[PDB]
RNA sequence: ACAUCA
């Protein structure tokens, strides 16, 4: 999970507060050019926002989408983007 | 803040 792994383990992305409501093939279809997918999936809460997870064959690569999608947001708009299994810092 | 099951 968090803190120098050194190899092993799988790199994903977490997008919540997501707009509307996303199909996993069609955010699959953004996040592809960045590297290979390996699965995907969304998710929601009681509490009404939508969440979706993005799995990624390298960290780093795919970090130039994270840091690009950063900046979360509430109280008057809804986008939140987090990286909890952050591999390879 | 939050999931993976393929």
Redesign the pocket.
Known sequence: ?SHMVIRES?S???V?NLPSHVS?RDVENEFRKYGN?????????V?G?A?????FEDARDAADAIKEKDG?DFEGNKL?V?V??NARE
């Open positions: 999970g799988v994903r992305i977490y919540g996993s997918i390996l699965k995907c999936d969304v998710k929601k809460t509490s926002a969440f979706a997870f993005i799995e979360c939140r987090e909890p299994f």
